[PDB]
C-alpha cells in the first residue's frame, strides 16, 4: 500500500562526484521542497531517489509507482491528449481537471483539432511554456505513489507560475507525495518540509519556521 516514511541516508555513497552527505525523510501527502544553489545536485538527487524506488532489472513493471517531471519538456509523436495520458487509461474527469489545473484549457481550445491536435515530426510546433505545461500535465495525470518534479516551472510568467503552483501542486495534488525542486520563497512557505542542498550535501531539513529561526 505505502510506507508512511522513507529514510534516505546517502552519505556520499551514490553518485559520489555530484552527491555527498544527503540525509532526509519523505512522508505521505507531504510537499517536500528541494532547494539550494545551482550546483547543489537537485536533479541528481531526484534521479538518485528514483533509482532506489524503481523496479529491478527486467520485471513486468506493470503500473509504475514514481512519476517524474524533467526540466526538458518532452513531446512524443502523437496528439496533445496521447502525450498527457502517456499509455495510461483515459478518464474524462481525471484528464479535464488535470488540463484546467495545469492551465491548458484556453490553449487547447484555440488549436484546430483541440485534444486531437497532433504534435511532433508530422504536426504542429509548440510554445516554450506550452511544452512545459504538457510535460507537467503528463506527470500529474499519472497516478503514482511518488512525484518527482524537477523545476516544472520554466518559461512561465510569475502570474501563471504562482497560479499553477497553487491550483495544481497544492490544491489538486494535496494528498499525493511530492518532491518539488523549486527556487521561489513563496513555494518554500507552502511546503511541508524544506530540503536545502549545497555542493552536494544536505544543509537544512525542516520547516519554513525553523528555517527563519536559524537565520
Amino acid at each position: 500500500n505505502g510506507d508512511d516514511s522513507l529514510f534516505f541516508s546517502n552519505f556520499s555513497l551514490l553518485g559520489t562526484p555530484v552527491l555527498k552527505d544527503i540525509n532526509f525523510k519523505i512522508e505521505r501527502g507531504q510537499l517536500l521542497a528541494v532547494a539550494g544553489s545551482t550546483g547543489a545536485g537537485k536533479t541528481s538527487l531526484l534521479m538518485m531517489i528514483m533509482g532506489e524506488l524503481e523496479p529491478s532489472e527486467g520485471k513486468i513493471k506493470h503500473s509504475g509507482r514514481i512519476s517524474f517531471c524533467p526540466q526538458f519538456s518532452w513531446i512524443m509523436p502523437g496528439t496533445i491528449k496521447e502525450n498527457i495520458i502517456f499509455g495510461v487509461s483515459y478518464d474524462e474527469y481525471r484528464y479535464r481537471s488535470v488540463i484546467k489545473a495545469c492551465q491548458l484549457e484556453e490553449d487547447i481550445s484555440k488549436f484546430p483539432e483541440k485534444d486531437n491536435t497532433v504534435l511532433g515530426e508530422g504536426g504542429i510546433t509548440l510554445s516554450g511554456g506550452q511544452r512545459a505545461r504538457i510535460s507537467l500535465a503528463r506527470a500529474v495525470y499519472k497516478d503514482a505513489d511518488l512525484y518527482l518534479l524537477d523545476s516544472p516551472f520554466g518559461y512561465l510568467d510569475v502570474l501563471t507560475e504562482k497560479e499553477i503552483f497553487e491550483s495544481c501542486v497544492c490544491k489538486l495534488m494535496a494528498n499525493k507525495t511530492r518532491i518539488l525542486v523549486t527556487s521561489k520563497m513563496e513555494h518554500l512557505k507552502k511546503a511541508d518540509k524544506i530540503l536545502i542542498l549545497h555542493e552536494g550535501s544536505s544543509y537544512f531539513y525542516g520547516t519554513f519556521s525553523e528555517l527563519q529561526n536559524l537565520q
Partner: nanobody, 121 residues
C-alpha cells in the same frame, strides 16, 4: 532460484538487545531489496523493516518508534536487523523476505524460515 536463512534469534531479558541476520544465496544480492517481518503467535503478521537495493533507502513498522535498524552488506550477501530495547510484547518469529519489485508497492517474492526471538521478563 534464491534461498534465505535467518540467524541471531534467542532469548534476551526485558529491555535487551539482539541482532538478527539473513543469508541471501543463489543470485545477485544487489538486484533485490530486503524486508523483515514478524509473527506473534495468534496475532497478525507484522511488517518490521525494509531496505532498498543499495541500502540508501529504509522504512520501518509503526511499532519500532526508533528501536530497530536495518542494514545490509552487498559484498558478504547478508541483511541484518539490529533490535534494541526489546519489550516482552516484541516476542515473535522474525521472517526475512526478498523482492525485486517497486519499493513503493512491494511484492515479497521470496521468504526465509524465521528465527525465534523471545523477550522473557
Amino acid at each position: 532460484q534464491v534461498q534465505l536463512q535467518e540467524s541471531g534469534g534467542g532469548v534476551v531479558g526485558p529491555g535487551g538487545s539482539l541482532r538478527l541476520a539473513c543469508a541471501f544465496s543463489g543470485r545477485t544480492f544487489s538486484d533485490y531489496w530486503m524486508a523483515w517481518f514478524r509473527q506473534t503467535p495468534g496475532e497478525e503478521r507484522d511488517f518490521v523493516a525494509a531496505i532498498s537495493r543499495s541500502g540508501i533507502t529504509t522504512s520501518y513498522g509503526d511499532f519500532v518508534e526508533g528501536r530497530f535498524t536495518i542494514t545490509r552488506d552487498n559484498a558478504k550477501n547478508t541483511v541484518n536487523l539490529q533490535m534494541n530495547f526489546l519489550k516482552p510484547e516484541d516476542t515473535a518469529d522474525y521472517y526475512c523476505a526478498a523482492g525485486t519489485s517497486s519499493f513503493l508497492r512491494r511484492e515479497y517474492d521470496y521468504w526465509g524460515q524465521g528465527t525465534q526471538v523471545t523477550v522473557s521478563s
